[model samples]
Target: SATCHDTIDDFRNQVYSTLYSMISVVGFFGNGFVLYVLIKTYHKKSAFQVYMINLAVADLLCVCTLPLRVVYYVHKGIWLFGDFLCRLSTYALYVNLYCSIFFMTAMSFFRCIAIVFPVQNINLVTQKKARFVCVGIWIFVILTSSPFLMAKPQKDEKNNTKCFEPPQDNQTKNHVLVLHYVSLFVGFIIPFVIIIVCYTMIILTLLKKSMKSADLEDNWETLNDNLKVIEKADNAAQVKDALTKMRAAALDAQKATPPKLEDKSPDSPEMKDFRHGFDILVGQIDDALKLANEGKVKEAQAAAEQLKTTRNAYIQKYLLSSHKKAIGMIMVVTAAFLVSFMPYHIQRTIHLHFLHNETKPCDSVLRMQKSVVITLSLAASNCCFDPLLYFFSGG
Candidate 1:
């Protein structure tokens, strides 16, 4: 039993060491590369790029302390570094992580506005506003992490220094747990919920555009078909009238005129007058057909003009709107935000919940420590992956 316990402890320590080391190495170069690319390639400053630059800078600052984290874990949770450095490094990690979340949420909101409202007041999402937002995030994150900074180091029975863990006293433990609860809500849950909401609205807007476009196409086709039917029916009615007039003239011609006073023949003056009247009726029918043709052309032209106006309005409403780039950025960052932070929050909740139980076993505490380290490493990996989001998003 003793030998098995020893092996398990050794294995856990090795896992922690390996995890921290890998994260530190990867996070350092990845974030550094992002910083270099942003500075070297992007010269013109836009609102999106400004926010991205701030995010990359924060990630770079966070990952800078990963090597220190690696050393601490390699020493098996023993802090060889002094008290001040321990607090600074650990507090910096949380500060940067939360800052990244805030910026990502901000970007999501910006995208929602761009997509939903389109060009109406679009200039509000400017670089100047983004800079102010970044400054505010930094201040907010610093204030939130101040409690972590105040957590002092304690030396165990073996004179090994431990930093940033819960205090042994019941009162301090309660306070520490409360701080973690506050951090969990403010740092992770609220920001994540906001991100989700923003993206939801953006997606809905896109769907609305697609649906509206389809409806417009269907309406235009129906209008065109209806106009054709109406014009053809009107022309057909006029043609019928022309044929009726011809028939009536034919009937009149067939009827023999009564002998007027002198028994006039069919080709006499009266008959000649009847034949001229029939010719006049034929000319009148031809003129009516000509007028109907002109009216048909005018009606078609009017319908076409109305349809064109409708199409132009539809284009202006949905098709010609900008913000393709912003949408891409928001999607990438929001996805990354969820993927990187969810596990951390979940594990933190479990850890905090279980730790509140006074009767929890020591073995469970050790196991929770491993869980904590693994989730923290995953959360820290976001600093590295965020730059990839920028690349793919076409920033």
Candidate 2:
């Protein structure tokens, strides 16, 4: 079965050769210089930049191989390159598209997380954090692209080797077609759907956040007035009133913390950690005030200094955990690793216990081996989890 396209063949040849050749030349240097500039800069860019770096390299691979396309088109549409080059270049090209698609989706997804979480950014160099992402994306892109390379290049009408031409009536026509449908559905639809939800959610959040921060500053302003009022108290009668108002102002300000958006809804883990620390500080203030109540004013005065260091540790540690996005990244890999290995190690006990000079015909010694093999397989299933981890870690 042959499709008719002879008229535009010449037209395409002209267009592809000129367009791709120019693109190859230009895109190579542009992406190439990105890394060059990275080297020249003395600072390490953030993990986000690693995503960019790999995407740029992905783009570079496509750019580099584009001239192969130019070569294919320019010489009477003949693939003078051998089958290997044809297959490899085609794989490389496909890899670029899917790889870049995931990279962009991942970038934007993580970006939305960082925005809504709205936690503080850090100077901590999480070099391997995004490397796990890049590495996993490669493994994912490479494995899934197998369907592209599954079919060998079909021969042309003139008995020449055609590289990417998926002629009908070939051995893998059905498989390739299925993969094509899957690619369009799985590859295209899924990422964009999540992206739309993430982006729309982000838009709604930022819109809510837009007016909230200004109001947030005003609520904090009330706490400042309480601060000065708490500073001077003539008697214990008004002192209770003053301290109560000041502390109440803080409770409200801290409770309605939209500005501190990292701790979600005041019930999640991040909020728990901050709340624990907040209670510690509040509890300590009461300790000194109790001392001051018994005329232990000097000890209470010294307790303010004690409160300073407590605040220091609490501030730094609480701030560090807000940087828990990094911790979240690490925790994901850790749990994936644990759950994966956690199952496989079960075999260690099973194997050690089952082998008592093990040899029995038509018997189930190999049942243990079968179980062992399965454990190994399940452990290797860790690869699947990190990608899944990426899906849930933002949540």
Give a tens-digit lDDT track for model 2, residues 151-222. Answer: 567677779776655333634655655565566556556765766666676667656655555565564565
- Give lDDT per model, in order: 0.64, 0.58
**What's the distance in Å from true for residue 235, model 2?**
34
Q: Specify the highest-TM-score model's number.
A: 1
The regions of model 2 sitting more than 4 angstroms off are 1-4, 120-127, 214-395
Model 1 lDDT, residue 150, Cα: 77
Give each model a TM-score. 0.69, 0.54
Model 1, residue 1: displacement in angstroms? Answer: 13
Model 2: lowest-lDDT 10 consecutive positions: 382-391
Q: Number of backbone collisions per candidate, in order?
A: 0, 1
lDDT score for residue 35 of model 1: 67
